[PDB]
Amino acid sequence: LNDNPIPKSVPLHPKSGKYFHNLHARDLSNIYQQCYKQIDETINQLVDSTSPSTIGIEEQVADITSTYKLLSTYESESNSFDEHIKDLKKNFKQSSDACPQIDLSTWDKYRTGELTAPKLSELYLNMPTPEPATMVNNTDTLKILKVLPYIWNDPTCVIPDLQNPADEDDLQIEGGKIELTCPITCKPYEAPLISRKCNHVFDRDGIQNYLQGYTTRDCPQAACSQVVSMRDFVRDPIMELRCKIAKMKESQE
Amino acid sequence: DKLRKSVESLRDFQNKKGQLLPYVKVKDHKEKLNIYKEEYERAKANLRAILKDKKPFANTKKTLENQVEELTEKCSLKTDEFLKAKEKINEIFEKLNTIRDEVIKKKNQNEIDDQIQQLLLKQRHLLSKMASSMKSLKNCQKELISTQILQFEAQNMDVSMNDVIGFFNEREADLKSQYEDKKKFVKEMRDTPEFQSWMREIRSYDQDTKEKLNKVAEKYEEEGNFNLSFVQDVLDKLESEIAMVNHDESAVTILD
Amino acid sequence: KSLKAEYEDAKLNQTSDLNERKMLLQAKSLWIDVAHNTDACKNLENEISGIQQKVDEVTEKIRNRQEKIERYTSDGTTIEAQIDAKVIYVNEKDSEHQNARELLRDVKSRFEKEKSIEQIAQEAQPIKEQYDSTKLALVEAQDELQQLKEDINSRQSKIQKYKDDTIYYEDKKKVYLENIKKIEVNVAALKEGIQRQIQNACAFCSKERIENVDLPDTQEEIKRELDKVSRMIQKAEKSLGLSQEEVIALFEKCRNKYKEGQK
């Protein structure tokens, strides 16, 4: 049926192609990145400001971690939607490459009814749900949060099996048997670092003194006491968070 | 021997019917008039159809312009609401920064102590409000992008219809050229160069006796069509074939 | 009387003049046909020249578009380098913002503790004004450091539009190439055959010897005259005729007989 006099299908003119190329989604990632940075900093300062004397911190940590999950899901949806829109633009431009020319015959054919060049309406009206899979769990902020629970009982002791990622959020954090003093400087480590292979804990000064000069060194603990390179060491805030929590607990009394 | 010329005098005089040239000219003019009339009808029909298509096309152009205007207004509105959402996000971030600054200030001053807990209650609620309101910015992003990509195909259609309008302009220029062709066809069928006059003269030279000869010649021309080729060739060749008579009817007259 | 007819033939005369007329008319008809073919070839090569001008403008469009594309590509490379430099600049200015926030908050908390010296307290106001002025100026700079992303998008879209224009120009270029190829094939095939017509016409009668005579150029009149002369010569042959060599001998024998009879 004729319906609207203009044909439902029409080839795309290069002038229209210019504007189509000009299309681009708003860079909401520019705002989401700083939203993530500011929520991270607010969380870190909140946990720093927590008073050990206060009891009943489980609900607040649960609420903030749920908020973190919610905002992470919202931000990943931004990535899914923009990649979907890029795919839709690619499909539209490749379909428009085979479009016929513009003339009276084409106008008559496409106004009388001919499914030759479909519109981009259905491309987004009934687009498949993004359904972002492989939920991000390697983010450092996610690991940092949810560590406060089960820490007041014995901060200085860390369960050896904490490295297990079996837990959906954070890890299996509970009491264990570990020393809070650097095995090198024989004093508490106010500037610690954690390895990415052996996952040990040291002091920045202690490790820099036990490794500098010796391009490759070993690890004091068992199963890793063999020459290794400094490149297997990285920085994780968790050790500093534990140290400051212990300092606050001690200074409370 | 003079009997040959006496007999062939009638054959020579028979060429007077060649008359034939007015008849072939009449049929040529009739077919030319028919061709011109059908050309005029075709051109007029084409112009009528193209104009009755353009006028709806002009209405479509106007409605597409209105749609473009109203969709650009909506495009400005979506950007305005996105900007206001971003401003609200910035305002709540500033509130968070101010409350954190106050928290650290009063903690430094402390070094009753419930002044810390009272603001710790407020900061968590503000963080939750920020998280909830982030939904408002997320929805503004999606709505904004979908709206722009949708009103874009409509303006693409508008420009395509503008190109079609240009093609219609070319087609109506062709129609104007066909109208000039109609005018020159009229100037050709003028028949002022001795045709309306030549025929009305020859077909009435003798209103008795000769009306029959030309009617018979016309009927013969319809039963058997002898084009201008016959007129030019045979009318002269019937006497030029032998071409040895001296057209001396006087010699034939003195025989008797 | 018989000798008079023989002499009139000698000046046969009808057959000779009809043969001369028919050969001349055939030569002129061949000349007219080849002239019309040459006019058609002239029109075809004029169309070729028009298509060549179209192809030349297409090529100029293609070359201007491609030089624009490459210069814009170089511009895009330098601009992306510059925006990376601006990104590191904005990162270090953000670190400076954090430092300014730190010292600002520190002095603000310091005099609060002092109240819980006046020169130090009034020396903060310059620091506060400098901090806020720098923060505002650098946020304004960050505004353009973000808008340059939209500039990159716009220039990328312009480059894509230029590439599409080049593709369309190449498409019409190949269409015109095919058009000129078919037209030149047509004119070639015409010339192959027009040359043969020229050669055979020259063999029958020289081009100079046939152009001198003025006859109508209309092909209808030429064919009508050819038919008329053919019918007339056929009638003359039916009236009288014999072997060609006999007529050649008669050419002189009849005149000899006439002259000897008269004397």
Side-chain angles (χ1 to χ4, degrees):
Chain A
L1 183 58
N2 178 22
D3 297 327
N4 189 315
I6 69 188
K8 60 182 182 60
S9 300
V10 66
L12 173 145
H13 199 260
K15 181 59 60 55
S16 168
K18 181 180 180 299
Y19 300 99
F20 171 79
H21 301 166
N22 180 270
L23 287 173
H24 57 272
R26 282 288 184 178
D27 186 3
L28 220 303
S29 60
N30 177 26
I31 306 302
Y32 279 174
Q33 57 88 2
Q34 60 82 227
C35 292
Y36 233 143
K37 95 187 178 61
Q38 78 87 3
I39 60 84
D40 172 62
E41 80 84 8
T42 211
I43 290 168
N44 77 22
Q45 60 82 15
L46 171 55
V47 299
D48 300 334
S49 61
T50 49
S51 299
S53 60
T54 57
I55 305 300
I57 314 304
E58 286 66 5
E59 51 268 23
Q60 81 85 1
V61 296
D63 102 76
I64 62 181
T65 185
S66 62
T67 296
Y68 173 93
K69 296 180 186 64
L70 184 160
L71 57 88
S72 301
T73 303
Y74 283 11
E75 291 195 23
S76 181
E77 181 168 346
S78 232
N79 301 22
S80 72
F81 204 111
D82 59 53
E83 58 81 12
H84 265 78
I85 216 178
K86 285 189 290 295
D87 177 70
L88 293 177
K89 294 171 91 300
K90 235 67 69 177
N91 190 332
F92 180 87
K93 79 178 187 64
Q94 61 81 15
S95 60
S96 60
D97 297 336
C99 66
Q101 300 295 351
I102 308 300
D103 58 358
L104 182 60
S105 180
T106 303
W107 179 80
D108 294 320
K109 289 195 298 300
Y110 293 167
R111 70 185 296 274
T112 304
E114 188 188 8
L115 295 168
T116 303
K119 298 183 183 183
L120 61 76
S121 302
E122 66 283 8
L123 276 54
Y124 72 92
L125 289 171
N126 59 33
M127 61 183 295
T129 304
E131 301 180 1
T134 62
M135 299 61 65
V136 301
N137 192 23
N138 189 23
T139 59
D140 58 356
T141 55
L142 191 160
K143 303 180 183 300
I144 291 292
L145 55 76
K146 276 287 289 300
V147 305
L148 192 69
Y150 299 89
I151 203 179
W152 304 281
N153 302 119
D154 194 349
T156 178
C157 293
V158 182
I159 192 75
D161 65 5
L162 179 147
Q163 309 302 345
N164 181 17
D167 290 2
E168 183 276 339
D169 187 1
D170 194 3
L171 303 168
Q172 294 181 3
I173 188 176
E174 49 273 345
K177 183 177 179 60
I178 192 175
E179 61 179 355
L180 81 181
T181 179
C182 180
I184 304 175
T185 62
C186 303
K187 295 293 294 185
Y189 36 80
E190 301 293 353
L193 292 175
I194 185 175
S195 181
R196 60 183 175 89
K197 287 286 174 293
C198 65
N199 307 22
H200 298 166
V201 61
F202 312 101
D203 184 4
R204 266 196 284 274
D205 300 358
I207 188 63
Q208 285 299 143
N209 300 329
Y210 204 177
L211 210 166
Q212 187 67 5
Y214 311 93
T215 179
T216 56
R217 216 79 235 100
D218 60 331
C219 305
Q221 302 183 4
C224 299
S225 62
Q226 190 57 217
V227 59
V228 67
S229 177
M230 173 52 181
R231 61 184 177 183
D232 299 358
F233 296 86
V234 299
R235 162 60 183 179
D236 191 323
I238 184 61
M239 300 81 68
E240 183 179 359
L241 297 175
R242 201 289 311 274
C243 288
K244 63 181 69 177
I245 291 166
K247 182 61 61 55
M248 292 184 296
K249 291 171 63 58
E250 259 64 48
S251 61
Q252 179 60 17
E253 60 280 1
Chain B
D1 289 345
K2 293 179 179 179
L3 301 177
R4 298 175 57 184
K5 295 189 176 183
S6 181
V7 178
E8 287 166 309
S9 300
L10 178 58
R11 176 182 174 183
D12 303 331
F13 304 151
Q14 184 177 1
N15 299 282
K16 295 172 64 176
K17 69 176 67 177
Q19 60 189 357
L20 214 186
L21 170 57
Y23 312 151
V24 296
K25 188 171 184 180
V26 167
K27 73 178 180 61
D28 175 73
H29 280 69
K30 287 181 177 180
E31 55 81 7
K32 284 179 175 177
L33 291 173
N34 303 330
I35 293 168
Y36 303 156
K37 185 268 184 180
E38 56 82 7
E39 289 294 352
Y40 303 164
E41 180 61 15
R42 181 181 61 84
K44 179 168 287 185
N46 296 17
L47 270 93
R48 179 61 59 85
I50 286 167
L51 294 174
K52 295 290 178 294
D53 299 1
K54 286 219 299 176
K55 280 184 178 181
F57 230 104
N59 302 121
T60 56
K61 279 288 104 188
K62 296 299 300 305
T63 204
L64 264 295
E65 188 280 342
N66 301 123
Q67 291 293 352
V68 174
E69 180 61 15
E70 294 164 15
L71 295 172
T72 52
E73 178 60 17
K74 266 191 285 294
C75 174
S76 60
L77 183 62
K78 63 175 188 60
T79 56
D80 298 0
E81 60 178 357
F82 165 81
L83 184 154
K84 95 189 177 180
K86 182 172 63 57
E87 289 292 353
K88 182 63 176 180
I89 293 294
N90 303 329
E91 181 184 4
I92 57 181
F93 291 171
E94 181 62 14
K95 284 187 171 62
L96 175 55
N97 303 330
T98 54
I99 60 178
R100 290 187 294 91
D101 299 2
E102 173 53 24
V103 161
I104 58 180
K105 152 172 170 58
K106 60 215 301 181
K107 174 57 179 62
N108 298 19
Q109 199 291 133
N110 177 21
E111 188 280 343
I112 189 167
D113 198 3
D114 299 334
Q115 205 68 228
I116 291 284
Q117 300 180 4
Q118 65 88 1
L119 184 47
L120 288 170
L121 293 172
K122 171 61 70 61
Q123 62 84 16
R124 57 183 62 179
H125 295 106
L126 292 172
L127 181 65
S128 59
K129 266 67 187 181
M130 178 281 300
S132 62
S133 61
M134 176 49 55
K135 172 180 176 183
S136 314
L137 179 58
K138 175 179 173 298
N139 287 271
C140 294
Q141 169 60 5
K142 182 194 193 307
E143 290 163 13
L144 181 151
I145 59 180
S146 69
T147 306
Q148 50 179 19
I149 64 160
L150 169 55
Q151 317 332 324
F152 231 75
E153 186 182 26
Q155 56 77 19
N156 297 129
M157 302 261 293
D158 187 3
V159 296
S160 71
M161 295 301 95
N162 298 333
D163 303 331
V164 177
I165 284 293
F167 302 151
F168 269 103
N169 180 88
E170 277 61 317
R171 279 182 284 274
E172 64 179 2
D174 305 329
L175 297 175
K176 300 266 64 170
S177 75
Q178 295 295 351
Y179 249 78
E180 276 87 58
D181 301 331
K182 295 201 301 180
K183 294 180 179 61
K184 71 94 169 182
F185 288 143
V186 172
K187 269 59 183 178
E188 288 172 1
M189 60 155 73
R190 66 184 173 182
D191 306 352
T192 200
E194 293 292 328
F195 173 78
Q196 74 276 290
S197 60
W198 202 30
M199 303 312 163
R200 71 190 183 187
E201 285 172 359
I202 290 176
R203 293 283 191 173
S204 77
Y205 280 165
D206 298 289
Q207 296 273 227
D208 300 271
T209 84
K210 201 184 61 56
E211 293 298 280
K212 298 170 63 178
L213 280 292
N214 66 36
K215 259 59 178 179
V216 175
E218 182 180 2
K219 295 302 99 181
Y220 180 77
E221 183 65 12
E222 302 297 346
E223 270 59 356
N225 182 269
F226 290 83
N227 205 18
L228 179 60
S229 60
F230 176 90
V231 186
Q232 60 182 136
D233 291 353
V234 174
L235 300 185
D236 181 70
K237 230 86 302 185
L238 182 62
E239 59 180 1
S240 301
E241 194 69 88
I242 188 66
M244 294 300 293
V245 279
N246 313 298
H247 211 250
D248 55 354
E249 177 52 45
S250 58
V252 168
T253 298
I254 61 164
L255 181 71
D256 64 276
Chain C
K1 197 276 186 179
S2 60
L3 188 62
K4 278 60 176 179
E6 295 165 358
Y7 176 74
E8 290 177 357
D9 300 329
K11 54 160 65 63
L12 182 156
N13 174 31
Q14 184 58 217
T15 61
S16 62
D17 59 55
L18 290 174
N19 179 22
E20 189 281 341
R21 177 62 278 183
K22 80 94 181 179
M23 59 75 64
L24 185 63
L25 180 58
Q26 291 170 359
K28 193 68 178 63
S29 66
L30 294 175
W31 184 94
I32 292 167
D33 299 330
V34 66
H36 114 77
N37 297 333
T38 307
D39 302 329
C41 289
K42 284 193 292 295
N43 303 329
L44 290 172
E45 61 80 16
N46 296 327
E47 179 61 15
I48 291 169
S49 301
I51 299 170
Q52 182 179 0
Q53 278 100 44
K54 289 193 290 295
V55 172
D56 297 330
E57 58 176 359
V58 173
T59 303
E60 96 82 0
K61 287 190 291 294
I62 291 166
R63 65 95 181 179
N64 73 29
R65 288 295 186 276
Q66 78 86 4
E67 65 182 2
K68 288 176 180 180
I69 286 165
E70 59 83 11
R71 79 182 183 85
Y72 272 110
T73 303
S74 60
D75 297 331
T77 55
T78 181
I79 292 163
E80 62 174 1
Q82 106 187 359
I83 73 183
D84 300 330
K86 294 296 188 302
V87 172
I88 57 175
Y89 166 86
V90 90
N91 300 329
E92 56 80 17
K93 294 313 299 179
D94 186 5
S95 73
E96 186 279 343
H97 286 142
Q98 298 297 347
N99 176 272
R101 201 70 166 87
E102 171 265 302
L103 296 164
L104 180 89
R105 180 63 269 180
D106 280 33
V107 295
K108 286 175 174 182
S109 198
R110 197 188 322 285
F111 205 59
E112 153 255 284
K113 257 288 130 289
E114 195 283 324
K115 197 99 296 184
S116 304
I117 35 156
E118 295 177 7
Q119 285 289 282
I120 295 162
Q122 61 78 17
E123 281 160 20
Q125 283 176 359
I127 301 175
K128 302 176 182 179
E129 61 181 4
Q130 173 274 126
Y131 135 83
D132 56 55
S133 60
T134 53
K135 185 172 65 175
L136 269 294
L138 299 165
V139 171
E140 292 176 0
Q142 182 179 0
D143 300 354
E144 57 173 0
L145 299 197
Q146 299 289 337
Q147 178 271 357
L148 50 68
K149 296 185 297 190
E150 297 182 359
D151 298 337
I152 285 296
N153 300 330
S154 66
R155 67 92 179 179
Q156 288 174 358
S157 63
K158 292 172 182 179
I159 292 168
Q160 293 177 5
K161 172 53 166 60
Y162 302 152
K163 181 168 62 178
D164 186 6
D165 301 329
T166 54
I167 293 168
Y168 172 81
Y169 299 155
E170 184 62 14
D171 299 0
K172 64 191 303 187
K173 173 70 168 62
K174 59 171 66 60
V175 170
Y176 302 156
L177 284 176
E178 294 176 4
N179 299 127
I180 62 179
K181 257 62 183 180
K182 59 173 64 57
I183 295 289
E184 68 180 359
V185 174
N186 301 330
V187 303
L190 290 173
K191 293 171 183 179
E192 277 59 351
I194 289 164
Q195 273 66 98
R196 313 306 181 276
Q197 184 175 222
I198 295 172
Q199 292 172 6
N200 69 30
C202 289
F204 288 114
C205 179
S206 181
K207 180 176 177 178
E208 287 68 4
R209 301 291 76 84
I210 194 63
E211 285 182 346
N212 53 15
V213 295
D214 178 70
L215 290 73
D217 299 330
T218 59
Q219 192 169 15
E220 50 272 12
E221 180 61 16
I222 294 292
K223 63 165 68 66
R224 297 281 73 85
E225 191 69 6
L226 180 60
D227 301 330
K228 176 262 286 180
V229 301
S230 63
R231 193 159 73 90
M232 187 172 295
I233 187 174
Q234 289 174 358
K235 174 263 179 179
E237 188 280 343
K238 288 193 294 296
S239 53
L240 75 177
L242 199 43
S243 306
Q244 70 291 358
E245 71 287 3
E246 197 283 338
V247 173
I248 295 296
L250 286 180
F251 285 177
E252 192 279 343
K253 189 66 179 62
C254 299
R255 297 185 177 88
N256 181 19
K257 290 194 297 298
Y258 172 78
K259 61 173 59 54
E260 64 185 6
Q262 292 300 141
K263 181 263 183 178

